[PDB]
Amino acid sequence: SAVKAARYGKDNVRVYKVHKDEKTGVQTVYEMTVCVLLEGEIETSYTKADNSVIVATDSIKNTIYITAKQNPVTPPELFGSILGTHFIEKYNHIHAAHVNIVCHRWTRMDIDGKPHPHSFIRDSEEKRNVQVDVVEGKGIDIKSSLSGLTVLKSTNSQFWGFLRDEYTTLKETWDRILSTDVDATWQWKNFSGLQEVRSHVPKFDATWATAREVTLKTFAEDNSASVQATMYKMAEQILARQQLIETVEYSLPNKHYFEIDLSWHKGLQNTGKNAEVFAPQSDPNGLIKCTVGRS
Amino acid sequence: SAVKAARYGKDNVRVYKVHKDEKTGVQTVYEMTVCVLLEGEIETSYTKADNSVIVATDSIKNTIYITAKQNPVTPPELFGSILGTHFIEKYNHIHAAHVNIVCHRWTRMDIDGKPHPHSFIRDSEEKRNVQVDVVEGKGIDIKSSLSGLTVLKSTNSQFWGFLRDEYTTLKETWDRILSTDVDATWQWKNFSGLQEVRSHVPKFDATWATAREVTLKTFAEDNSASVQATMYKMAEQILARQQLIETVEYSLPNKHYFEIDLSWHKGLQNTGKNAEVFAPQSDPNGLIKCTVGRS
Amino acid sequence: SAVKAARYGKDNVRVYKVHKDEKTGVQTVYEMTVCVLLEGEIETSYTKADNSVIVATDSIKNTIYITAKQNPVTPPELFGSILGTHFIEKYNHIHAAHVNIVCHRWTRMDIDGKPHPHSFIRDSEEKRNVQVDVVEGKGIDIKSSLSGLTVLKSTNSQFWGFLRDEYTTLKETWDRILSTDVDATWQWKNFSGLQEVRSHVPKFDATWATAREVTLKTFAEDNSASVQATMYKMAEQILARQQLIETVEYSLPNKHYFEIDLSWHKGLQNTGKNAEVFAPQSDPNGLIKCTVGRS
Amino acid sequence: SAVKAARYGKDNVRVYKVHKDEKTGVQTVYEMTVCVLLEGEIETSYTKADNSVIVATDSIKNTIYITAKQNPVTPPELFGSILGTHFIEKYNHIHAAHVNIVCHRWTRMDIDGKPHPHSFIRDSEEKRNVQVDVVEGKGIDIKSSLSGLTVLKSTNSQFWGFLRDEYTTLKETWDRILSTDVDATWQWKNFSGLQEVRSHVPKFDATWATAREVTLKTFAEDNSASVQATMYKMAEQILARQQLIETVEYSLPNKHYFEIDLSWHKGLQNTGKNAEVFAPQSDPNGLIKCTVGRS
Ligand SMILES: O=C1N=C2NC(=O)NC(=O)[C@]2(OO)N1
Ligand SMILES: O=C1N=C2NC(=O)NC(=O)[C@]2(OO)N1
Ligand SMILES: O=C1N=C2NC(=O)NC(=O)[C@]2(OO)N1
């Protein structure tokens, strides 16, 4: 037998960083959860009890904190690139570093209509994420995403004209609820190294903001034919607004809200045009995916 | 043996309701999770297999949906009072109804700076809750709360002057992070019935808004001596602003963020005035509680 | 305003302890999560920023570990009593200690049919818990429980003869699935102090074992008229087998499994006597409670 | 722009099935959660609002239940193969079906030492899973796994000889706790279709049982040099015992249990040979992966 694939490292590393402007008093906070997994000439740790090739996961943890102390942690695409580059540069025998970062929201509070210098609210469980793969001789591959953006529209969603056969019970509808948890990922052009990543730094926040804005506006404004048709519109708009993106991926649950027929009770009308009270369904759920690129 | 206490009903009933203004096109959505547990002359269902005394939990579920169809679901204090009153009025042998409602956030989206007529975002996992106990001959007892309001301040929190003995390792501090998940409950004067609840309806939203505003402003502005001292200030302010409240309760975790000494690595300074990178601790956590009333 | 109630302490303290028999080589492990909340003459910490009255939560954490080092951690009723007694004895101004312990399963592995001396499996997420309230001048009040014991029976459950009115849609049944997550609590006679608790130590494990055995056998063997009727039988049997218990409480969800009518598809018969495939319902759920004592 | 990848279907479909032996009275239950995602000539649903190509997710759900009614649900490798084959055979334009099944434990109860005919316990949250990819013209690719198997050993784990540099603080150890949640996956030889899968049916349960037995015995008996070295031994043994497997993958967290130095308190000795009380760490955690194949 032989090792066909191996990677190892530290997961679930919680990290907070504060920036303090001593002149103005304004403080800014960042909070993340980090995973770093390494690949390289490590097979003998598995096959021969050779720990000499292992950079201890505890040391990887230390390195995450040290790197956060010595560098900006934002945008996460940059921080992940710095962190990944460190491992392949420091350790000859390590040839890839896979860095995942989940960024947690700490939005500055407004108190009596003024932004507070050092108080923050977790205004959503929505995350901003990166997956940064630094592979020796193959540059830096970055996938950026937003996830856990939970939305609902109460009308201007439709679903009709789908295939109907002996397995089909679903009624066509011209007016339904649509609710989802948005997971949207944009995949960057390969970067040659850390200089090229740095050269594009403003594009990371700008493209996240575009992706979020497009997602929300398209969801709100599209009189949706299906989840498929709506998500495609989102993806094509994001591609049109950032040429350094190669693909956009969406993964969207269809979180169903069922009508409740109450006509058995005193003739109460709660379906069709009279539908007001619905049963949110926890499971099952539709799950709709696509990856859009340029033609 | 004998039944000393018993209650039963339906838990985890998810409910959505939409309001549609046909004139303006503006739709408004409400989403809840409801629990109704009943008490009364039901002991023989337990002791004698006498199901005749059981209003089926499935029927309780139906009743929740019917009541939501026929009544406003907001404020939740009112909806819970209507729902609880129904069971003690409809069923002679039922003498108490215990209604818990968790209200989920669906905040109207702003698209290109304008409120959208039918699209919403789950802008926080913060909840607004009620616990409405309708007890025959004893009126309606309402506890209102907000929960899951997660906040952090990066300075202007202190903790010194605490007891020090042979069990103490904690260093005094004059500048630390404070983060919590706020659970705040206000307990209303007993109401005699549904007419009295209705007579105070505007006070429910107003008092929730006050509790939230006071919580946030006090957290942000108090140069905190301890969680204890800060939460007391919140409670006393809320009591001062609504005379129909009898008590205010807070339950606050102290979600610790630990300094990370990095001086073992190249003399890096990351403690005290130089502390920038911290380790958020998932557990354990301080837990600080108090109930404040009038003197 | 004034403090009507207050308690504070450390929650979510994870604790592991190992016992090593050096003669035999057999090791035994214990793992818990502990919460200790204190009450006493602490109001000035809330009202006057008086931290002198606060035993720091960090110190409470230290004390949990020290107490575990110096004492048995089993049975949890004893450990909680020792821990709670410590705080009211050590600190004049502390007058109650509220100790909650959740015990996690680490069941010894059998390898090739022989018990292994130092390897364990989490064989269930079922917990054994205690709530120990040590109140100065009022002894030690102990509630013991098992929770998260998830069971299902595929027949020999019935539900008919329940109240039927204009809110009722549920069909009577003489053969259904019954599934629940058992939460069972037995409340001990008040103990005067730690000597009396110690004097009954073997009864704690024995009564937990009885409660579990009775729960499982009654669930399996009772041709159940309702959740109410079955749980009452469990409680009365446990009371009959331990005179130092005063009450037994059950809280049982009815985790519904719905039939699926498939007759619209090629006349497939999947209801009544032909029911084989069911839809487990995540929510809502019945919730059935009772507390049984002696007559 | 163009669709580079797309798949869609129904996730989180809970399914129960009962088998009743009318002769013996013995009933046997199965419970799963199923996901089916389809690929094919579906791009126009995304690009042109063409729903004619969509087999509704609701219909996919119906099909899961119908297929469970008409076929065995065990072993899950077979059920998933039947289910996936159905979609590519029934719908000309569907060219792949991706079926994920999570099997939940319902272990028959023993009551008074005898197996009960119709009562079951969730004896572990450990799962048995399959991932069955049925791809038209490319047969059936099956990955089988066990997950959520949580174990701990209290000694006979070591970690020394790892790389030490300026990022390293971890002390070498010759005696530590090792705890993990086992996720083990075995990848089958490609099967040409459903006849070939059926021809190997007994091997599915047998290989799951082997994987579990090997995992537990190796964990318990290996005086472990590292997680890496132990997991490799597991994988090579499983490969040796089933020639129709091509690879075995493990993904193992190192769930750390930290010593607690208590020497600051009355000289208490709780480290090294005197270590009895430990602090389980919820995060971060090592994460160790490898895929082993034949040479
Ligand atoms: O039943 C279905 N209803 C749906 N709605 C939709 O927008 N697209 C689908 O493909 C569908 O996904 O959930 N299938
Ligand atoms: O160690 C402690 N640190 C704390 N901080 C605080 O504000 N009050 C406490 O009582 C304390 O709660 O967490 N105990
Ligand atoms: O609809 C109901 N079905 C039930 N079954 C039961 O055993 N008792 C109830 O009171 C019931 O609880 O779930 N209500």
Ligand SMILES: O=C1N=C2NC(=O)NC(=O)[C@]2(OO)N1
């Ligand atoms: O600090 C470390 N300690 C570990 N133990 C181990 O068995 N292997 C590692 O590579 C290690 O993973 O957790 N890194």
